[PDB]
């Protein structure tokens, strides 16, 4: 919406290779935001983080991996290390083991009363669905420090990459060998999800393009054995995992576009605070880049309930970034920060 002015600017430019004028002509598109205009951006960040956390809470084995890590940190009889500080520290709407027992006894009780009622009358029974929702509402009360929380997000990312890698391998081998259309594939992949009855239906349908199938079946119903192993280890359907991953993608994308709108409207605060810290220690474009990194690190840990403006909170982080950049090398030799 601002390229018509930039075209008339670049028609005058005789191929300027200096990145300073280039940087402050690409950053001048987005104007200044208002004071109360970023409150809605922060609320969209809240909605995205809450959607990602609901997608984590709907995953049933997250409590299982959390109890496994808790047993591994509880195993050798005496620990007060830094790994225990990475756990919950619950916020309201100095960690002692007595409160840990008092708040984990009912969690273990809800876990052992939820696990035993899985096979009762169905996989997705309504009473079992209410028990899963109650366990999720219990799990949403205790929220982690983001170190172990991002560790569990990365573990869920690795599990999602394994599942989608197996599914992508099956799909690419099918497209490479039999060249199956998506209309006869997506419907069966949504409907059946358990056995090879869709494979038998594809055999029962004549379809003379599908005659190149018998020499690849020894891999076709071998790659589905890995999916059977995943369903034996997890006990979940494919469509629910895809819906959780889609909601997690939406909850990450909302915060991502919010960070885009934040940085494209606050590059100029970075350059205004960075052009006064150019006392000939190093060339200032690295200071601009480190100020942008400090802006990112200040946006990543910004609060809303404080009621203050973002510039006062971000000033300390961007001065810390400029300080560690000007104290990183500062010479041809290496000198520490305390020196």
């Amino acid at each position: 919406a601002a390229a018509q002015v930039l075209s008339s600017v670049e028609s005058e430019i005789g191929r300027t290779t200096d990145p300073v004028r280039m940087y402050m002509r690409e950053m001048g598109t987005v104007e200044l935001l208002t004071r109360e205009g970023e409150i809605d951006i922060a609320k969209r960040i809240e909605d995205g983080i809450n959607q990602v956390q609901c997608s984590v809470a709907e995953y049933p084995e997250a409590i299982t991996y959390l109890l496994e890590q808790y047993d591994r940190v509880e195993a050798e009889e005496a620990r007060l290390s830094d790994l225990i500080t990475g756990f919950v520290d619950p916020n309201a709407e100095s960690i002692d083991p007595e409160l840990a027992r008092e708040k984990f006894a009912e969690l273990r009780a809800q876990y052992v009363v939820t696990r035993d009622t899985i096979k009762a009358k169905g996989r997705s029974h309504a009473t079992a669905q209410e028990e899963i929702l109650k366990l999720s509402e219990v799990f949403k009360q205790f929220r982690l420090v983001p170190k172990q929380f991002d560790y569990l997000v990365n573990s869920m990312r690795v599990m999602m990459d394994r599942v989608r890698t197996q599914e992508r391998l099956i799909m690419k081998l099918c497209v490479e060998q039999c060249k199956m259309p998506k209309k006869n594939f997506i419907t069966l992949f949504t409907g059946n999800e358990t056995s090879d009855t869709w494979f038998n239906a594809a055999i029962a349908m004549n379809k003379p393009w599908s005659e190149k199938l018998h020499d690849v079946s020894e891999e076709v119903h071998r790659a589905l054995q890995k999916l059977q192993q995943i369903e034996e280890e997890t006990g979940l359907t494919i469509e629910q995992v895809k819906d959780i991953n889609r909601r997690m993608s939406i909850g990450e994308a909302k915060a991502r576009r919010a960070k885009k709108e934040m940085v494209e409207a606050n590059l100029r605060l970075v350059i205004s605070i960075a052009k006064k810290y150019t006392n000939r220690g190093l060339q200032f474009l690295d200071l601009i880049q480190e100020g942008n990194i400090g802006l990112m690190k200040a946006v990543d840990k910004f609060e809303y309930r404080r009621g203050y403006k973002f510039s006062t909170y971000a000033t300390w982080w961007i001065r810390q970034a400029i300080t560690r950049s000007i104290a990183d090398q500062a010479r041809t030799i290496r000198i520490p920060v305390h020196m």
Binding site: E12, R21, R25, G28
Partner: peptide
Amino acid sequence: YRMMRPGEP
């Protein structure tokens, strides 16, 4: 002003 410093609206 375009003759002074090019690369600016």
